[PDB]
Structure formats: C-alpha cells, structure tokens
C-alpha cells in the first residue's frame, strides 16, 4: 500500500509550526489512491503546511483529505492579516503538480487551499 494516511500525518507533524493548532481529517477510501497520486498528495500537504506561519492571534490549520469522485485536499487556515502568506514559490509548485496530475488547484481567501486530481479509472 501507499501508507497515504500515515504520510499525511507525518507531513503535518514535520512541517506544522508548533504555535499553530492543527486538525487532520480523512474521508473516503484512501486505499484506492495510486502511488503517483499519493506522492502528489503528500507533497501538496508538505508544501501547504510548511508555508503556514504564526499570525497575530492564535490560529488553526486544518488539513482534509477526501476520496470521493476524485482525490481532493483542502487546507484551511483561519489566520488573518497576512496577504503574502501562501504566495511564494510553493504556489508555483502546487500549480505545477495540479497540471502534472491533470487536476486543479484553488487558492481562496481565512485562507483555503484546495488541490484535486482525478482518480484513474
Ligand atoms: Zn497562516
Ligand atoms: Zn473530491
């Protein structure tokens, strides 16, 4: 197997700033995701979490990985006041991986990062 769930947990544990509260949620049959897509999911979470910094107030960073019609990752950051957060080279990385996977990516503003890709049929 891909150990996708364990790898998402490890990515959050390694890269989440200790000043941020985190929540990690999984929904759906993670075991159906193939190796290439699991690698993308891990890299997306690593990149998104490593770019999250401390805000003036206490903040929460939520990571949701869902397998439904597709694979979709939603990283929500309720922190405010940092318009340059998430706008670095990591954004190029996330967009590049979405194109690599034939999927899509959205940055919306707290701030929500959504990365999705189709599952192979
Ligand atoms: Zn933040
Ligand atoms: Zn989905």
XYZ file of C-alpha atoms and ligand atoms in Angstrom:
123
model
C 0.000 0.000 0.000
C 0.858 3.685 -0.232
C 0.658 4.442 3.520
C -1.087 7.634 2.389
C -2.747 8.314 5.751
C 0.488 7.856 7.700
C 2.342 10.077 5.232
C -0.183 12.900 5.567
C 0.104 12.683 9.366
C 3.906 12.730 9.120
C 3.848 15.733 6.774
C 1.725 17.728 9.223
C 3.833 16.599 12.192
C 7.108 17.540 10.493
C 6.092 20.861 8.951
C 3.392 22.419 11.160
C 4.677 25.318 13.233
C 4.319 24.432 16.913
C 2.387 27.660 17.517
C -0.481 26.524 15.287
C -3.325 24.262 16.317
C -3.813 21.544 13.716
C -6.660 19.252 12.703
C -6.194 16.415 10.201
C -9.257 14.694 8.736
C -9.553 11.822 6.262
C -12.715 10.861 4.376
C -13.286 8.014 1.952
C -11.288 5.054 0.612
C -7.706 6.307 0.835
C -6.514 2.817 -0.120
C -7.833 3.280 -3.681
C -5.374 6.110 -4.422
C -2.446 5.010 -6.574
C 1.243 5.579 -5.839
C 1.678 8.606 -8.100
C -1.375 10.394 -6.700
C -0.386 9.564 -3.118
C 3.021 11.134 -3.815
C 1.298 14.288 -5.069
C -0.992 14.427 -2.028
C 1.954 14.143 0.368
C 3.878 16.849 -1.493
C 0.838 19.155 -1.551
C 0.340 18.834 2.202
C 4.061 19.292 2.898
C 4.157 22.453 0.793
C 0.924 23.948 2.145
C 1.724 23.269 5.792
C 5.331 24.467 5.568
C 4.110 27.826 4.232
C 1.726 28.414 7.154
C 3.191 30.862 9.681
C 2.145 32.376 13.001
C -0.457 35.143 12.942
C -1.015 37.950 15.434
C -3.749 35.854 17.071
C -3.852 32.130 17.739
C -4.841 30.281 14.573
C -5.893 26.827 13.388
C -4.640 24.937 10.328
C -6.977 22.195 9.090
C -5.953 19.519 6.582
C -8.743 17.477 4.991
C -8.014 14.662 2.536
C -11.087 13.272 0.804
C -11.548 10.498 -1.742
C -14.931 10.790 -3.456
C -15.404 11.289 -7.184
C -11.736 12.371 -7.168
C -8.909 12.962 -4.712
C -9.201 16.366 -3.076
C -7.093 18.074 -0.416
C -8.352 21.137 1.439
C -6.022 23.097 3.715
C -7.829 25.792 5.698
C -6.032 28.491 7.683
C -8.216 30.745 9.831
C -5.389 33.220 10.425
C -5.804 36.774 9.183
C -3.713 39.760 8.177
C -1.013 38.018 6.086
C -1.825 38.575 2.392
C 1.661 37.389 1.391
C 1.155 34.022 3.120
C 0.986 31.147 0.574
C 2.015 33.364 -2.385
C 5.606 32.102 -2.616
C 7.312 29.553 -4.830
C 5.194 26.886 -3.138
C 2.213 28.182 -5.073
C 4.058 27.536 -8.340
C 4.851 24.052 -7.025
C 1.204 23.351 -6.177
C 0.017 24.589 -9.576
C 2.695 22.559 -11.366
C 1.614 19.368 -9.602
C -2.041 20.027 -10.439
C -1.094 20.235 -14.119
C 1.108 17.133 -13.758
C -1.843 15.193 -12.302
C -4.450 16.529 -14.736
C -6.187 18.172 -11.799
C -6.956 21.630 -10.442
C -5.853 23.999 -7.704
C -7.543 26.935 -5.978
C -6.199 29.490 -3.505
C -9.099 31.383 -1.933
C -9.210 33.984 0.816
C -9.249 32.862 6.374
C -7.385 31.175 3.518
C -8.295 27.897 1.817
C -6.023 25.889 -0.479
C -7.791 23.205 -2.499
C -5.951 20.717 -4.708
C -7.783 17.977 -6.586
C -6.974 15.361 -9.193
C -8.952 12.608 -10.923
C -8.597 9.001 -9.875
C -7.560 6.650 -12.659
C -10.439 4.535 -13.970
Zn -1.469 31.307 8.257
Zn -13.163 15.335 -4.098
